[PDB]
Amino acid sequence: HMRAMNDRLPSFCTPLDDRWPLPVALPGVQLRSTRFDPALLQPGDFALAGIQPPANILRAVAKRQAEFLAGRLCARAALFALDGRAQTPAVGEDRAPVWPAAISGSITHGDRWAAALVAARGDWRGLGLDVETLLEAERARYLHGEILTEGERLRFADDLERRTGLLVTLAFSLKESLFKALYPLVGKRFYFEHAELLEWRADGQARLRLLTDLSPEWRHGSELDAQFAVLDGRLLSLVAVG
């Protein structure tokens, strides 16, 4: 189809990568990712990619424009791959993406790295993806009180002293993914205190526990398995709800 191939990638992004960056694969998901540089962004890249930006992103700063667009390219390519639709999710009033009917996905973008994954809602009701740069030990010791609950600081006291940046970065990433997976289901807003990390292993497997009631099904003590990958000085984590 001739016009859907008029949406070539703007030069500030590397080609959309389909390689799975996580330990365990998930059936029925499509994840695309890119490395971008907000400096290479051109004043006509949005029309080039065929992605209509909302009024907010038109007058935003260059770093935000690049992150939004790069995340929207990955989303459209992931969605195209799953079912063939070159559609971009709108921006909700609650800042969340507005995925098409019977589609659940997630978008993340950090320092020069972006990705998005999508799935049919009949396979995965909720999806939360989040990448975070590895915190330095100092800044991690400064943020450990906000991110880690006192039960987590005790449970992972060893890593808290030895591998400070890894543990805090991870709970940061896992808890943000958990939020992005459950929010389009529960509607409520919960924060770093409302979940705890329970176990994490080098093979990339993790497990979370809810600390408050979010819905009849998502009650206090409900647990969700997650996975994570630590490569390239950044940590990427995934929470998927069947």
Ligand SMILES: CC(C)(COP(=O)(O)OP(=O)(O)OC[C@H]1O[C@@H](n2cnc3c(N)ncnc32)[C@H](O)[C@@H]1OP(=O)(O)O)[C@@H](O)C(=O)NCCC(=O)NCCS
């Ligand atoms: C959504 C949130 C977690 C992302 O913060 P971030 O990880 O620094 O930003 P990321 O780039 O990694 O993810 C950004 C994307 O999240 C998506 N997003 C925003 N709000 C969302 C929501 N309520 N539900 C699902 N996805 C959401 C958006 O698509 C955004 O990309 P866009 O704005 O370019 O479209 C953050 O805005 C937030 O609300 N943090 C507090 C909530 C939290 O941490 N709870 C812990 C629960 S244990």
